[PDB]
C-alpha cells in the first residue's frame with residue numbers, strides 16, 4: 001500500500017523506501033536532514049536505543065538527537081557528528097573555556113574527582 | 126640528466142623530484158619507505174618542527190614525520206597517531222586505558238596538571 005514515506009501501521013510507524021519495501025534494521029537520512037532508525041520489525045526508533053554496540057537517542061518523532069541532551073535530570077552527550085553516546089571521555093565546553101567529563105555509563109560527572117600520578121597520568125572517578 | 130624519482134642533495138639542502146622530474150614544493154609526500162615528508166615553498170625537505178597549514182608536525186633528522194609520543198628537549202609531546210599533527214589542549218588516553226594525559230595549549234605534557242571544578246561540573250585545567 002505505502003511507498004517512499006513514513007507509514008503508521010496499527011499505531012506504529014514504519015518507512016517504505018521509494019519501492020514499497022519497509023526498512024528493517026536500517027538507518028535512513030530522511031528528506032528533513034534528520035536521522036531515523038528502524039528495528040528488526042520495521043518499527044521507527046524512539047527514545048534511547050542501542051544499535052550495534054553504540055547508544056543513540058531519538059525524540060518522540062523518531063529523529064536522532066546529537067550534542068548535549070538531558071534525560072530525567074541527568075545529562076549525556078551524543079556525538080554532535082555521529083550521534084552515538086560518548087562515555088569515559090572529556091568534552092570541551094561550548095565557549096572553549098573548559099571540559100565536562102562523561103562517566104563510563106554516559107552520565108555527566110557533576111563532581112568529578114582526579115588524582116595525578118608522578119608521571120602525570122590522570123585517573124578519574 | 127635532470128633528476129627524477131629521487132631525493133636530490135643540491136649544494137646544501139634536500140629535495141625530491143618525482144618520476145617526471147618535477148620538484149615537489151609546498152606539498153606532502155609518502156615515500157616508498159612508508160614515511161611522509163614535506164617540502165618548502167622552495168621544495169626544501171622538512172626537518173624538526175614545522176607548522177604546515179596551521180598545524181604542527183615533527184620530522185626526524187632524515188625528514189620522516191613522526192607520530193605518537195615524542196620527547197623533545199626533555200619534555201613530552203603527542204603527535205596524532207595517523208595524522209601526525211601535534212595535539213594540544215586535549216586529553217590523551219594512556220596506552221593501558223588506566224587514565225589520561227593532558228597536553229597544554231603549547232603542546233607540552235603536563236607534569237602537575239592543576240584541576241578546578243565548577244558547580245555544574247565544568248573542569249578547568251591550569
Ligand SMILES: C[C@@H]1COc2c(N3CCN(C)CC3)c(F)cc3c(=O)c(C(=O)O)cn1c23
Nearest residue numbers: 152153154161162178182190207208209210
Ligand atoms: C588525498 C590526499 C592525502 O594527502 C594530502 C595531505 N596530507 C597528507 C599528509 N597528512 C599527514 C596530512 C594530509 C594534504 F595536506 C593535502 C592534500 C591534497 O591537497 C591532495 C589533492 O589531491 O589535492 C591530496 N592529498 C593531500
